[PDB]
Design a protein around this ligand. Structure first.
Ligand code: CLA
Ligand code: CLA
Ligand code: CLA
Ligand code: CLA
Ligand code: CLA
Ligand code: CLA
Ligand SMILES: CCCCCCCCCCCCCCCC(=O)OC[C@H](COP(=O)(O)OC[C@@H](O)CO)OC(=O)CCCCCCCCCCCCCCC
Ligand SMILES: CC1=C(C#C/C(C)=C/C=C/C(C)=C/C=C/C=C(C)/C=C/C=C(\C)C#CC2=C(C)C[C@@H](O)CC2(C)C)C(C)(C)C[C@H](O)C1
Ligand SMILES: CC1=C(C#C/C(C)=C/C=C/C(C)=C/C=C/C=C(C)/C=C/C=C(\C)C#CC2=C(C)C[C@@H](O)CC2(C)C)C(C)(C)C[C@H](O)C1
Ligand SMILES: CC1=C(C#C/C(C)=C/C=C/C(C)=C/C=C/C=C(C)/C=C/C=C(\C)C#CC2=C(C)C[C@@H](O)CC2(C)C)C(C)(C)C[C@H](O)C1
Ligand SMILES: CC1=C(C#C/C(C)=C/C=C/C(C)=C/C=C/C=C(C)/C=C/C=C(C)/C=C/C2=C(C)CCCC2(C)C)C(C)(C)C[C@H](O)C1
Lengths: 42, 170, 161, 181, 40, 194
């Protein structure tokens, strides 16, 4: 894959948008399978 | 110079006999805009899909596997959408197409012919001459099967008869 | 119970919360036919609402007079799953993010163009750092005691006053 | 014997329709052209030779077993415990159920792991210079010049014929329901 | 020997008393499923 | 200079045929991004875990420790049945093993800090079975191969336990085919939820 295109995807706004979309996405998935967790179950 | 295929059309200029199967037919000038390596990769990929599809029809009327129900190939598409084997085929094709994405990057980076996957298990290609004739035959068959594909699917829609049974009747 | 609160499993106001929440959904369901997509959507919401109320009742949460769960955060161990353990989980992630971010800024200082490493991140090296964060409490304390976390006051620029 | 050049050699073709490839060497007992798909180019020749001789020897022994068990010929009391049928398929299923097939499986697999796998590993590594298919199993003499000569070619051709014939016999029994003899 | 007569190791047989192929009854192996598909 | 595993791709750098199990397979080019030493450490570790895990599933079908807490032929059911205290004991012991066997060089920036450290080589040879240097190359090859095969095999066994609520050997001996009327893949967004 082109190294200048990979250097473009390594730029701060793309990584910030991708990482926080990935981060938001597994919070969303964790609340789909395991909803309404007000407390650590113990 | 003039196009070999269309005498009155000028040659495209990105089609200078570099690829085998080149008859200068490119009126829309997609090769003046787009990379011809990408276009040839797609040509051979679409054509190989079409060739497997036309054979796919013909064999599927003649025979079907005992564990699967007998039915027409378009009905097979819908049955295997809802049964699960369609997603199987889609997954494994997509899996191979991942390494195809790597292959197309290798082609763009200059290190591979557009449809070459080094797939010669039976050693049918012997030397340069027979390989050039084989790939000319492959291109011609690939284009012809793409045409053929449209006919079998569209004709089944218009008249609900299979390709072999449609030759048999009418 | 604690602070005059009632366990949610025997709170009558918690019981009325669950019932009112389901009556509100059932009257929306009364306007749809059985197999419709709006009926299945609301029937799945009545199942989810009941499940949540059942789980809260059996969890050891304490309800108020208002029938809502209340959190006890004074440090007692019977209630550590409401703040202390979520907090321990948070600080592990937070220190991980901090240790990993700190490790990359120190790497980028030794670069050919240090400010280009911060707008164009060296993703293989930055991923090398993110994996290291799992033992940040040991790595950061050893960093502290080995004199590499804290810089002395006389290498820090301050205002004249 | 060898008949190098006449049969089983360089310039020997069973089917001159297919040109004899270069990659197929002319020193392996039984090489008479016949490499269409070009497998000799990339496979280990020593490995595929050992595999060919072993497939040959099973085919011969299985052919003998099929003939005996389809002529009704048996060992004393074998038909008493096993079936009285001459269907090779039916005998296999009931000799499996009797444990006899399990005992043959056990002992074949024992020989084939403790002796066959080390023999294969050394023959391909280059630690022993064992010719393929050799297990020093010549109790009743009949070796010497013949052992490296005609007998190697006679064995390989009788084995190829045994493979084709055994496949033929089993599929004829399948399509008919009646075995041979 | 670390395991007494009470609290002894439990060694069961997973083959459940039937064979690999050509079974009859409440025992249908994977090889039987290949035979069932090929004859249908 | 093409790959031997994938003949139409270029042979990947950092793969030079030195390592055991090296056949030129890295189509996605992870070796160009991630140091091959870390990748081989992780491959040997994943494979060693999966050899134990695949053997764990099959033997746990056959042989059990005494007691009702250890009587689960289905291995996925054993996760819940096995005493929690002892399961967390296993986890804690694994963590202690991870720090000590790696000698506190745990991370992506300090494992292999010692130039003597070799990928996958933790000094574990209790019975000195690798003492013979003649067997060394084929042991390394067959360790890598057993590890790869067991990764694939354990993955299959777990997801066949999910699909068929049966233990692996008695799933082979009491096989039932997939009806497709259950466990359809995907679909969370096709019906727009619910
Ligand atoms: C080796 C890898 C592998 C594995 C584990 C599977 C597993 C499966 N395949 Mg898939 N498949 C694979 C490779 C694989 N496939 C490949 C390479 C292709 C070609 C692209 C397909 C094409 C395919 C189709 C078209 C279908 C399956 C189906 C199935 C299911 C069969 C159910 C069963 O066990 O009873 C069958 C048992 C046997 C056949 C015994 C042998 C199962 C999920 C079927 C299914 O039911 O999907 C839900 C189905 O219709 N597969
Ligand atoms: C505002 C000040 C304040 C502060 C700082 C704390 C701090 C603490 N309280 Mg809390 N508490 C407070 C006010 C406060 N309390 C008030 C006003 C009440 C009402 C009387 C309580 C009632 C209360 C109860 C009933 C208990 C605590 C406990 C604890 C300790 C548990 C945390 C821990 O993990 O340590 C100890 C553990 C470790 C150091 C290591 C664990 C791994 C912690 C020191 C618990 C405790 O253990 O008491 C000492 C406990 O049982 N607290
Ligand atoms: C991971 C990098 C990092 C680290 C270790 C710290 C460390 C600290 N910061 Mg923060 N800071 C950072 C990034 C970081 N900062 C960034 C990006 C900003 C801009 C928003 C700030 C803005 C900021 C302010 C305004 C203040 C601090 C303060 C502090 C101190 C107390 C902790 C705190 O209040 O957190 C607070 C953290 C934030 C408000 C923002 C953090 C945002 C994200 C989560 C961190 C950045 C992640 C980064 C992209 C890492 C990528 C790593 C990857 C490339 C490998 C401590 C010195 C406080 C202080 O001086 O108190 C003594 C304070 O008042 N910082
Ligand atoms: C190497 C192969 C082999 C050989 C040499 C024998 C040889 C023999 N078997 Mg047989 N047997 C074999 C394989 C073989 N068996 C197999 C594979 C099975 C399992 C299916 C049996 C099952 C079997 C039974 C059940 C019995 C024998 C018996 C006998 C003995 C009686 C012979 C006699 O008086 O003639 C009899 C001659 C005729 C009937 C011809 C008229 C004889 C030594 C008998 C025995 O135990 O005697 C000591 C007996 O009852 N055999
Ligand atoms: C026509 C068959 C045939 C031929 C020509 C050979 C020839 C050879 N074999 Mg092979 N072999 C065969 C069959 C054959 N074998 C079978 C079936 C087996 C499995 C039992 C073996 C197992 C075997 C081993 C394990 C080894 C050899 C070896 C050898 C070599 C030296 C031995 C020798 O010359 O004595 C061969 C002598 C004869 C063939 C005389 C004839 C005896 C006949 C065939 C017995 C007939 C049984 C019976 C009557 C069946 C007919 C009736 C039935 C239809 C009902 C030589 C190249 C050795 C070697 O160096 O390999 C490279 C070696 O290590 N062979
Ligand atoms: C600090 C040491 C220590 C102590 C005091 C205990 C104490 C206890 N353990 Mg724990 N355990 C420990 C370390 C320890 N464990 C470690 C390090 C591990 C991880 C390897 C475990 C894993 C473990 C499990 C999985 C279980 C226990 C259980 C128990 C309890 C019942 C013990 C019993 O009845 O034994 C008397 C019984 C025996 C001595 C039978 C022993 C069976 C054999 C020896 C097992 C085979 C070992 C196997 C080969 C492991 C090899 C890997 C290892 C070398 C790394 C008891 C509270 C059980 C429990 O929670 O019960 C409620 C339980 O199921 N333990
Ligand atoms: C080296 C390891 C190799 C792993 C190979 C993976 C094997 C299994 C993969 C799927 C098998 C077949 C799938 C058919 C199943 C299928 O396609 O279902 C379809 C499903 C969407 O549902 P639909 O819109 O199709 O609904 C259709 C209607 O018919 C039913 O309502 O697609 C998905 O999005 C599910 C997958 C989650 C997508 C996100 C996954 C998590 C992201 C993590 C980061 C990326 C990782 C890779 C993402 C691709
Ligand atoms: C490459 C590779 C290998 C391979 C391979 C494979 C699988 C090769 C398969 C190749 C195939 C399947 C070629 C098929 C081409 C079909 C064509 C050109 C269509 C013709 C239809 C026409 C003209 C029509 C029509 C009609 C219409 C539309 C509708 C009707 O009403 C009427 C009518 C019937 C007249 C192997 C593995 C051997 C190894 C080797 O080392 C490398
Ligand atoms: C670190 C890491 C790796 C790894 C790894 C992994 C996955 C390691 C997993 C290891 C495991 C699963 C260890 C299990 C130990 C079980 C024990 C000790 C059972 C004790 C039973 C007892 C005490 C009892 C009892 C009794 C009770 C209470 C009452 C009775 O009624 C019943 C009973 C009689 C039985 C490796 C090595 C792969 C690679 C790399 O280096 C990285
Ligand atoms: C190193 C060292 C030593 C040691 C040691 C040890 C503990 C050595 C143990 C090594 C082991 C346990 C190796 C196991 C490999 C397992 C494999 C390859 C399984 C693959 C499964 C597959 C392909 C499958 C499958 C399946 C599928 C999915 C479908 C299923 O329905 C069924 C099925 C099962 C067929 C010691 C300690 C002695 C000291 C020494 O000084 C140094
Ligand atoms: C959607 C969907 C399905 C489907 C489907 C599919 C794949 C349907 C097929 C679509 C295709 C392949 C249409 C293409 C037809 C080819 C044409 C029109 C070329 C004609 C040649 C021309 C005009 C001239 C040629 C020329 C002349 C004059 C002579 C000289 C040469 C040349 C210049 C070339 C299913 C089955 C999956 C089911 C599913 O439930 C729903």
């Amino acid at each position: 894959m082109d190294s200048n295109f990979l250097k473009y995807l390594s730029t701060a706004p793309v990584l910030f948008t991708v990482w926080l979309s990935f981060t938001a996405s597994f919070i969303i998935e964790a609340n789909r399978f395991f909803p309404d967790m007000l407390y650590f179950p113990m | 110079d003039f196009s070999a295929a269309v005498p009155f059309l000028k040659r495209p200029s990105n089609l200078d006999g570099a690829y085998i199967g080149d008859v200068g037919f490119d009126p829309l000038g997609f090769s003046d805009v787009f990379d011809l390596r990408v276009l040839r990769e797609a040509e051979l990929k679409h054509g190989r899909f079409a060739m497997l599809a036309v054979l796919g029809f013909i064999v599927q009327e003649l025979y079907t596997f005992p564990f699967f129900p007998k039915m027409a190939p378009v009905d097979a598409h819908d049955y295997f959408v809802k049964q699960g084997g369609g997603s199987q085929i889609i997954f494994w094709i997509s899996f191979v197409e991942l390494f195809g994405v790597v292959a197309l990057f290798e082609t763009l980076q200059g290190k591979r012919e557009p449809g070459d996957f080094a797939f010669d298990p039976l050693g049918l290609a012997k030397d340069e001459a027979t390989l050039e004739r084989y790939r000319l035959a492959e291109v011609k068959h690939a284009r012809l099967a793409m045409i053929a594909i449209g006919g079998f699917i569209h004709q089944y829609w218009v008249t609900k008869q299979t390709v072999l049974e449609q030759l048999g009747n009418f | 119970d604690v602070a005059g609160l009632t366990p949610c499993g025997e709170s009558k106001e918690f019981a009325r919360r669950l019932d009112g929440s389901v009556k509100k959904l059932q009257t929306r369901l009364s306007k749809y036919e059985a197999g419709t997509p709006p009926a299945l959507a609301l029937q799945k919401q009545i199942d989810k609402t009941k499940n949540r109320f059942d789980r809260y009742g059996k969890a050891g949460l304490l309800c108020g007079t208002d029938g809502l769960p209340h959190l006890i955060t004074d440090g007692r161990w019977t209630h550590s799953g409401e703040f202390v353990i979520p907090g321990l989980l948070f600080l592990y992630v937070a220190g991980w993010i901090g240790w990993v971010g700190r490790s990359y800024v120190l790497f980028a200082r030794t670069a050919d163009k240090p400010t280009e490493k911060e707008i164009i991140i060296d993703v293989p090296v930055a991923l090398s750092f993110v994996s290291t964060g799992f033992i940040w409490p040991f790595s950061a304390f050893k960093e502290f005691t080995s004199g590499n976390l804290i810089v002395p006051a006389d290498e820090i620029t301050v205002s004249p006053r | 014997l060898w008949n190098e050049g006449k049969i089983q050699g360089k310039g020997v073709s069973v089917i001159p329709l297919f040109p004899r490839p270069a990659s197929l060497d002319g020193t392996f007992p039984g090489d008479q052209g016949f490499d269409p798909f070009g497998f000799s180019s990339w496979v280990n020749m020593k490995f595929v030779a050992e595999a060919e001789i072993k497939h040959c020897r099973l085919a011969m022994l299985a052919f003998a077993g099929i003939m005996v068990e389809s002529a009704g010929i048996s060992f004393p009391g074998a038909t008493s415990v096993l079936g009285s049928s001459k269907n090779i398929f039916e005998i296999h299923d009931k000799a499996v159920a009797s444990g006899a097939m399990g005992q043959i499986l056990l002992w074949v697999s024992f020989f084939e792991v403790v002796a066959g796998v080390p023999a294969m590993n050394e023959m391909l590594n280059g630690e022993s210079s064992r010719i393929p298919g050799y297990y020093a199993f010549d109790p009743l003499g009949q070796g010497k010049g013949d052992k490296m000569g005609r007998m190697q070619l006679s064995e390989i051709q009788n084995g190829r014929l045994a493979m084709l014939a055994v496949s033929g016999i089993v599929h004829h029994t399948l399509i008919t329901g009646k075995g041979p003899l | 020997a670390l395991f007494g007569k009470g609290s002894m190791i439990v060694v069961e047989d997973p083959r459940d008393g039937c064979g690999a192929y050509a079974n009859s009854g409440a025992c249908h192996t994977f090889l039987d499923e290949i035979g069932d598909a090929l004859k249908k | 200079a093409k790959s031997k595993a994938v003949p139409f791709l270029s042979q990947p750098e950092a793969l030079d045929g030195s390592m055991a199990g090296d056949v030129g397979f890295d189509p996605f080019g992870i070796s160009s991004v991630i140091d091959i030493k870390w990748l081989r450490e992780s491959e040997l570790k994943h494979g060693r875990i999966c050899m134990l895990a695949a053997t764990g599933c099959l033997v746990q079908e056959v042989v059990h420790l005494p007691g009702p807490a250890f009587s689960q032929k289905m291995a996925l059911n054993a996760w819940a049945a096995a005493p929690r205290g002892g399961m967390i004991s296993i986890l804690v012991a694994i963590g202690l093993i991870e720090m000590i066997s790696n000698r506190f060089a745990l991370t992506a920036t300090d494992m292999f800090a010692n130039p003597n450290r070799v990928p996958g080589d933790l000094g574990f040879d209790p019975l000195s079975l690798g003492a013979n240097p003649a067997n060394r190359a084929r042991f390394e090859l067959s360790e890598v191969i057993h590890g790869r095969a067991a990764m694939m095999g354990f993955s299959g066994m777990v997801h066949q336990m999910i699909v068929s609520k049966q233990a692996p050997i008695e799933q082979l001996m009491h096989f039932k085919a997939v009806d497709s009327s259950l466990m359809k893949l995907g679909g969370a967004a096709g019906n727009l939820g619910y």
